[PDB]
Amino acid sequence: LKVAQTRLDERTRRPNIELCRDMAQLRLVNEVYEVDDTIQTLQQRLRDA
Amino acid sequence: REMEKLYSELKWQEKNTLEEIAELHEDIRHLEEDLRRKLQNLKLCHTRLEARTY
Amino acid sequence: DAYFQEDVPMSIEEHYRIRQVHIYYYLEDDSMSVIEPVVENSGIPQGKLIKRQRLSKNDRGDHYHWKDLNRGINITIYGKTFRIVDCDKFTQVFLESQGIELNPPEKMALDPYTELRKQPLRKYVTPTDFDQLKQFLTFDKQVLRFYA
Amino acid sequence: MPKVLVENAKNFPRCVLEISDKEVLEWYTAKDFIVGKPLTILGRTFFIY
Amino acid sequence: CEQIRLNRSAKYNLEKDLRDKFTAITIDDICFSLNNNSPNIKYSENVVRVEPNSVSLEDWLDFSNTNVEKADKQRNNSLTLKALVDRILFQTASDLRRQCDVVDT
Amino acid sequence: WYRSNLTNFQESNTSRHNSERLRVDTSRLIQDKYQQTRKTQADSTQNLG
């Protein structure tokens, strides 16, 4: 999660034009959410156990 | 560049697919031997019944 | 930065008091000292609580070394339990440079007596300017029709 | 005009004193006279169009 | 718990360098990427003529090789601990077990 | 007596089935979340790359 969060944290400082919205911008946005999902998931199975 | 963009992506989806294929050869084998060993348990619960009707 | 709740059940002002302190650790000879800052209007004899000495940790003779000192910790010294709440940006730097993970902060707690002696804050917000006169001047000679 | 009275009208000498500045929670303004929607003056429902 | 302290301290120092190295890598990237027709190419005073806080190549290599060794040293002092607690656990268990089977008899 | 014993023995057998469930299924979830996050991250790399 933090690897992804940071990977993006810096890409949000690219100068003028650079700051874009390419494939990377998404796969990373999707990944962060996906990872957040896995964490919430295991949390339930922990409560279940 | 545009084709090297597409080719490098196209090669990368191959190795991602080939990894996805590789662990599908072993899964269906594990499904098959699961199916086949569970035949042996239907074999068992039969054999108890009629030695009992005896 | 630390604090400790002792008791005060014989008073009319509250049932529990908070005594603000700063606890110092010395790297010269692994020593500690506890200093109580002077509160302006408190009746307690403020001052120095514990001098510079190697304060004992347990009964076997061990003393407090800096390995087990964090931002949030409840070390007890001579019957008094101190809840440290925060460090300064030099103590943090030293502790993280040795491997020690700094705990999350806590606020300070507050003594009910001294905060109930906070004299009133003499102020009034200014009244508005949209009185009868300005509402008469900026909205004169204009009325709305409504057909109903 | 008063629209909603403040919450002490049950102990208010409204037989011998009038409804002054402090008794009104909100007065009628230009927002209340919506052109198109029904409006309720005292006793009467209007249809400002 | 104390080996953890040493290992975590080791990192703090290892990180300190990892960070500084980056800054230097970036600096040399902008130093390399500089032609006579580049945008902001201005003059200066005393530039780096003298430096009262620098270091030599011999030294830069010491700092690195030293910091590296310290980390390998702690790692090798960690695999030891990890393999002295494995028995300590196997031991503790088997011991209490032996006595429990005894008390039974 | 025969009833009580069963009511008990059965309830015991039961809570040892609802526990075994979580256990073997946790293996699935854990060996999934991990391998998922792994290849999902590698995606970010290839893309960023």
Added chain:
Amino acid sequence: PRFRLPDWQTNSYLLSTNAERQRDASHQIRQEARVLRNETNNQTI
């Protein structure tokens, strides 16, 4: 023939987006497999 460049671009997109759902379709069967196989084997023992 002489298929034009924009319909050539969607050829790569179609093959690429085929890979994502198809690997995920295969991946979906997996988790459905192990959830079955485990409770299949455990139930009958």
Added chain:
Amino acid sequence: ANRAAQHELEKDLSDKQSAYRIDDKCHHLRNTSDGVSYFHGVERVDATV
């Protein structure tokens, strides 16, 4: 004329360069790599241009 080129052309090389700088590092932002920190909000920021 051929100067108006440089201006933009070179105003591009800079952004093009800062890109590689704030993009190559991300290509190798490994897990547990000096830096990987925590940021809450880098999954809802997209000031893309």
Added chain:
Amino acid sequence: KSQSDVNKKLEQRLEEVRFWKKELDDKLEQLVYATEDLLLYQTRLQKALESF
């Protein structure tokens, strides 16, 4: 040719400083992984103190 040399020399310094950023990160990895085991083995030990 003068500039060519200072460029080649700056280029070489990069190769070196980068090799050292690597042998200092691959080491971070080893030591972080070492600590991960010790912290998990710590849990296993803590549980035992109560397990008995």
